[PDB]
């Protein structure tokens, strides 16, 4: 019943190959719903989920103005940060921003988020009070001072507690048939001898939404954390996700192993075994 909205901004310089590319994508939970790319033939905000298509031209135009202006601002920001780190104009650099709001199961604001990174490292983040900043280094302190002087945190807070929550609630309603539907994992266990005396048991979860899931192996009821090979949860391309966990076991001990699956969509947690 808990939900979040996030926008993810990536601004990437590329000296000798034009001005920095700016992309923005928006998500509700694990569902992308919009994109903007300054490298598109005709840059404009585009729908990426069916439930957003109902928004009118004013919406799309508003978004497009925001992202076009951000495109220019982030180019200035990239110039600024190159100088804060005394970097040459030769290299390519990236600013990333992810921000948004989390709602609890009652649709109330749980907390806001607004974090930025430079070249893949924490740079500056708005604290949970939505009023103060945490700067990673002396370069980010320059940004912090500039944002404190301009009372930027106040602007972020007003958005995070206002429009962010309002529109997230709107999207959740408009896309309720999918956004508020948890699809449980379809599961099974496979068995593959690796030699005369060992075999691989692999526990599968497929077709689940949202991506959050817990998949573990136990032996005689004990967690096999170190012995379990766990792949990263991965998108199927139909909105759903997949994951597996594997353990190599002594031939003949298969029945001592149990796979445990926790997921929002599940009536109740599953325990599964290999079934020859």
């Amino acid at each position: 019943g808990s939900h979040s909205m996030r926008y993810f901004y990536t601004a990437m310089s590329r000296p000798g190959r034009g001005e920095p590319r700016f992309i923005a994508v928006g998500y509700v939970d694990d569902t992308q719903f919009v994109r903007f790319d300054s490298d598109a033939a005709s840059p404009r905000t585009e729908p990426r989920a069916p439930w957003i298509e109902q928004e009118g031209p004013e919406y799309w135009d508003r978004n497009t103005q925001i992202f076009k202006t951000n495109t220019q601002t982030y180019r200035e920001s990239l110039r600024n940060l190159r100088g804060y780190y005394n970097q040459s104009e030769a290299g390519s650099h990236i600013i990333q921003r992810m921000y948004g709001c989390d709602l609890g199961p009652d649709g109330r604001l749980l907390r806001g988020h607004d974090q930025s990174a430079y070249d893949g490292k924490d740079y500056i983040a708005l604290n949970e009070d939505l009023s103060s900043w945490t700067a990673a280094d002396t370069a980010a302190q320059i940004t912090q001072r500039k944002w404190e002087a301009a009372r930027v945190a106040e602007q972020r807070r007003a958005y995070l507690e206002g429009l962010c929550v309002e529109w997230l609630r709107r999207y959740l309603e408009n896309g309720k048939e999918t956004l508020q539907r948890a699809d449980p994992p379809k599961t099974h266990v496979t068995h593959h001898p690796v030699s005369d005396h060992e075999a691989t048991l692999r526990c599968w979860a497929l077709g689940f939404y949202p991506a959050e899931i817990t998949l573990t192996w136990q032996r005689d009821g004990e967690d096999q954390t170190q012995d379990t090979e766990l792949v990263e949860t991965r998108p199927a391309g139909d909105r759903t996700f997949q994951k597996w966990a594997a353990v190599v076991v002594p031939s003949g001990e298969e029945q001592r192993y149990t796979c445990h699956v926790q997921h929002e969509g599940l009536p109740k947690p599953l325990t599964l075994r290999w079934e020859p």
């Binding site: 919406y59 930027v152 602007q155 429009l163």
Partner: peptide
Amino acid sequence: LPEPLAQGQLTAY
């Protein structure tokens, strides 16, 4: 909806 533009110039990093 993303964060809107402020009344004046947005503040760069």
